[PDB]
């Protein structure tokens, strides 16, 4: 994978090139207002060491931070998400994998149209990486999910159990 981050809009300003995870961009970029993804699925993080607001980027060109749904021009770490050959996620009504349960292998622009709950209280990522979104149509806060058990919403770094849409990390 390969991404180029720019301090300014329209691929202008001081830039830096990443080919792997960087936990600390601070010495290199003071801000980030545009990015070009040559290859790979990337998660950008507001704070260093893969914390704070998260943003999913794919192959493509982002001329301003609003095109990756960025609330600000703050990018201080970035993650190259591993390839997954396949994708499967179970979502549960209640914590500790209890209550109603639905299993997705494909993207969902509106969870409430298939699973009539505004909140997901646990989920099991059986295959591949996913991005959860707070709102429908891939909007609101983003949360990267690696294969794993997630017994409560805190386990995927959210401050609430609200979930409106989710998408496979695929290029």
Numbering used by the authors: 1 to 171
What did the article's authors report about this structure?
The high expression levels contribute to the refractive index within the lens which focuses visible light upon the retina. However, this halts further expression of HGD.
In addition to these covalent modifications, the protein conformation is subtly different, with an overall r.m.s.d. of 0.23 Å for chain A and 0.21 Å for chain X. However, this is dwarfed by the 0.67 Å r.m.s.d. between chains A and X in the aged structure and 0.62 Å in the fresh structure. Aging of chain A leads to an expansion of the NTD and a contraction in the CTD. Aging of chain X leads to a contraction in both domains, and a notable reduction in the distance between the two.
